[PDB]
Every structure is written in C-alpha cells, then in structure tokens.
C-alpha cells in the first residue's frame, strides 16, 4: 500500500475465517521470508489455499 497514511494490515473479509479475526481492533503478525528455502516452502506448503 503505497499510500503513506495507511498503517494497517489490510485483507479480504473472507480471509478472516482462517484466523477467526474481525476488524474491531484485532492485531496480526506478519513476517516476510528472506531466505530462499523459507521462501519456497511458504509458497508451496503454507499458502492459504
């Protein structure tokens, strides 16, 4: 999100069923895999599909 005034993690409402989340003030963690091996298994194993 290249708007500098947005500080929130935004996601589709139909994805909240995975995390049992809603938008009343919930917080969520996010980390981006930097290693190649961790990056491969993120995409092949741990994708939300």
Partner 1 sequence: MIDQKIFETTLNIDDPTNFCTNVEAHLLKELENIYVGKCFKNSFILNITGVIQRSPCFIMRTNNSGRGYMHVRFSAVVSYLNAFDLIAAVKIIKNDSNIILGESLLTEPVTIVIPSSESQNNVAEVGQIVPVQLANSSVYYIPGRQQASATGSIFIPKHTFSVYHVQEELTQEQALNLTKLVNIIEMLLESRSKKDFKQICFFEKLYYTYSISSDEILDLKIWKGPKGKEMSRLKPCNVLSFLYDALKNKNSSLGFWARPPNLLKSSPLAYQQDQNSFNATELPIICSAEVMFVTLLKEIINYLQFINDLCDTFNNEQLIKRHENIWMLIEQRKIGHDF
Q: Which does 26 bind (CB under 5 to 8 A by kind): partner 1, Mg ion, none?
A: Mg ion
The residues binding Mg ion (CB under 5 A) are 22, 24, 26
Does residue 37 bind partner 1 (CB under 8 A)?
yes
Q: Rounded to the nearest 5°, which phi and psi values hold at 29?
A: -95, 150
- Burial (CB count within 10 angstroms: exposed 0-12, middle 13-18, buried 19+), residue 34: exposed
Q: Which does 2 bind (CB under 5 to 8 A by kind): Mg ion, partner 1, none?
A: none
DSSP H/E element including 21: none
Q: Which does 38 bind (CB under 5 to 8 A by kind): Mg ion, partner 1, none?
A: partner 1
């Amino acid at each position: 999100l290249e708007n500098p005034k947005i500080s929130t993690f935004q996601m589709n409402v139909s994805a909240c069923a995975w995390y049992n989340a809603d938008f009343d003030g919930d917080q969520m963690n996010l980390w981006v895999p930097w290693s190649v091996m961790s990056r491969v298994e993120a995409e092949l194993l741990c994708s939300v599909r």
